[PDB]
Write a protein that binds this DNA or RNA. Sequence first.
DNA 1: CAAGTGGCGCATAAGTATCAAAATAAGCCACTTGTTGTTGTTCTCTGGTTCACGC
Length: 74
Amino acid sequence: MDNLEVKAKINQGLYKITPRHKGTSFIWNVLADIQKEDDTLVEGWVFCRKCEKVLKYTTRQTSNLCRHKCCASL
DNA sequence: CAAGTGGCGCATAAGTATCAAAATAAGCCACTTGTTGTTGTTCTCTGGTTCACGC
Ligand SMILES: [Zn+2]
């Protein structure tokens, strides 16, 4: 569905990345986001800078993202 | 001025849940070498050297 489609698009370089999310927590220290082709941030998705995995982002809660393996010992 | 509060959400998070696809041990049986156990047999040891002793 959308997950594999956006993974392919970001792998091919259609969308750029913005490694800065302007956040207080350490979750965004090693996490990035996806920008649309018109320099607009996408909704509900996050990108990682070490293992390069796209995950669903929820505005209501971010506890699940803390369980990501790349953030094990950070 | 400055020590005291709400507020605007607010970006965070220690909690909870259920939906999958895997990582494991349990009870049994195969079966082949090597390996341990009673329960028999078979050959010596002690029968004994001279003194009390009366017959
Ligand atoms: Zn990661």
